[PDB]
Symmetry: C3
Subunit: 315 residues, 3 copies
Amino acid sequence: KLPIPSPQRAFTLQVPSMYIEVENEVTVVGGVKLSRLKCNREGKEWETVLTSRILTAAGSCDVVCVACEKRMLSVFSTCGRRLLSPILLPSPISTLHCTGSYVMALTAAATLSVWDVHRQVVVVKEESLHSILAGSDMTVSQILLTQHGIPVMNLSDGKAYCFNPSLSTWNLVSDKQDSLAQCADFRCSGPLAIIQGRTSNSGRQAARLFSVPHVVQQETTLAYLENQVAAALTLQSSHEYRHWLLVYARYLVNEGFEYRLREICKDLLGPWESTVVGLRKRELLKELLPVIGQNLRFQRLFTECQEQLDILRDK
Amino acid sequence: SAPALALKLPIPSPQRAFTLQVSSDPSMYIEVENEVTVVGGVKLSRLKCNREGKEWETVLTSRILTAAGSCDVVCVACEKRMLSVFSTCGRRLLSPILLPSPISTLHCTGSYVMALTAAATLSVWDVHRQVVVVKEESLHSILAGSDMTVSQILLTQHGIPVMNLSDGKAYCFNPSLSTWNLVSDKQDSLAQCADFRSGPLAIIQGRTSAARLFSVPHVVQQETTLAYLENQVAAALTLQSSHEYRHWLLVYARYLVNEGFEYRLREICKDLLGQWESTVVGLRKRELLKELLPVIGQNLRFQRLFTECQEQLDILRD
Amino acid sequence: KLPIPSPQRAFTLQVSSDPSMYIEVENEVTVVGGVKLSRLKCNREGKEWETVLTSRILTAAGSCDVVCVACEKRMLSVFSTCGRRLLSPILLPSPISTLHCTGSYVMALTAAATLSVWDVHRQVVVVKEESLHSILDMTVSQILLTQHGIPVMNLSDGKAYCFNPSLSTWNLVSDKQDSLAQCADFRGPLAIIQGQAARLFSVPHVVQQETTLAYLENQVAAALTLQSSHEYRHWLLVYARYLVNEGFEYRLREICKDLLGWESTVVGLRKRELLKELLPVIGQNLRFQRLFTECQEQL
């Protein structure tokens, strides 16, 4: 189970200062007991009434949402207009979280839902967290909801899983006890930085291992860098994806891994969806080409892309 | 550890024959005769369909338990948890669909087929587009705490299921949000105290056939009126009922203007005059905003906002 | 329920079949930092790539497009044909049992007999965690995986069910014991899954006509369910010729209306190129001259 917020006479909750006040069953109208939802944001205050008691609340710069007694979920605009019909959840609410126009409800049954209330679509449809934690005695130490409506569970053992909605999977994006980052020898703001944590302030070049042949450290470094690219992808973190894609590409250039390099260049050139995490794949290519060019070994690859880019410019 | 007892939806009994009036406007009768012959060891059941004196028929390889039909489709549910869907003139449209549990009831509206199973799951398919609309949603959430019944069941012309419960509550399933949504509630209705100036929502509510409050200050009646009208607008959107959405949005905007709800009507106008869909519920939003600006202009406090909206709108000569 | 592969020190598996594509796994070979590494190696034609993983590989699978591995702690990783990790490791809800890959389609069947299919090229799920308790009381047999990512399960009772991703359903596309094929009288993956009729002495001709109708309509719908495009063309036009020859006018007109115009394509073919191909079979019957005429609508 999960702790269910107990009924109260009234309460206040904070969240860019803005807060929520709730007063339950303050008045009666046509036989219907009313509960009040007040939102104090900057200078302006809005309010509204609901026909059942408010158990918990959450809000963002765009959205206020409220979990009420009869397993009901209501969502209101930045200025207090009801956005959606009340949502019946299959289990009593445990916690609510909002990020932008994304609303996340975690129920007492340990299931997790995420809606995009601006677009009026589900993002994460009732994902059990048993399916993650399994027979292991772990604990979801934290839970974050990104600006894309992507949930991330930081577990007690150092592993972080985030749900990919298009793949409909939980995906490992950090494992502090099996990280390859200290081994990784190659030439902060976003989500991936925050989840992994060692992104506090540590961009130090790593040392060559005295313990293993060079090829082992090369493969550890490859694997680490491809993990970072992949992870920024599943997290849909556009800026982090660009950063790691460029670092990885530089490493491929400097170590001479031609097949992986040509492969990503082909994928970024197309002949296919022209975008990844909302970036133009060919603009990403065009950003990599100078790095490719600084190594004479790839002069033809650099040239091929460049020429195939110019032909693309001439519609 | 299983419950000693768990209610289920009932499964139609095997019958040798039955007929069923499945059509109204184009009146349509369906006849079923089960296990009437054998070919190659395979026992066959017959399905017959009568529409306006024209008659088609076909055979199935298992007993037909129940059936439904519209102007567009006829579908049958059979033992071994199979569902088959046939065109208006009798052609099988899709492979037999394996249901997760035995059928209980079938409904059709246009090309939408809805199956409610013994396990109390609900499915809706658009057989014209051949896409699932509602994927095996448990009815447990809606039924827990009820009196074990559902008074009425609608499948709207956009394939949305609506459950009207005896306690006055109606829940519809929204396919995009993927939620059960409360779109009506006669007991907790704010409608009787709301003071302001054929569709699905109209049917679900008892409303197709207000006083000043003495006990509370005027602001409370305004807030109940606002909550009610927002509920109506949201309910119409959830039902994807376009005429009713436009109607309630227009009443709601008139109210916001009358009582001077500045920030709410600002928000609504910004949304209607725009990552932005030009459409809601199959309507051109800017057209609706144009249908507002009369009402908004009718008030002095919103002169600036009417001017700005007719401005950026008239900038559509470009 | 289903069996889990047991840990090994090393193993090899031929995966693809276009060239000899071999895969070699060496579990926990070296330690970088405190991290034990397992090696993944892939040989295809003359080319060898490799990479490391941080947990032990339990089984592998692959195709001309991808190699994927299932590891301990219920993890699933996917790599390009150059050894590049394509996706973050995927947490399976239950330990793996088997893996299949067809092109860029990856299918996991876990020990809890739940089945999943991902399109790793487009990065979308095809089949999201489908239990086989429902589709299975008989036991299972061969599991196929088509080139559009459709799962197909042949069961021990002769029935095959394939999972349509759009309808999100299990659909019956073959049933040997109840097959209407032996008695039907008319003159890709569906062939593979399924495997002149005498006239019947024991039933009236109308029963064999309806059985033949239902069989052909089943074949059309099964090809359309399997997304097998050439089999759909074939069976549509065999069925259409049965309709023409036997005089079933309303089914025929209906097919023409649909193919005329509304979605403009079917199973990746132009719905009007099909009307073009079956206008002449309509034309060889005098009774349907008007229909062959009424379809002369061009533009």
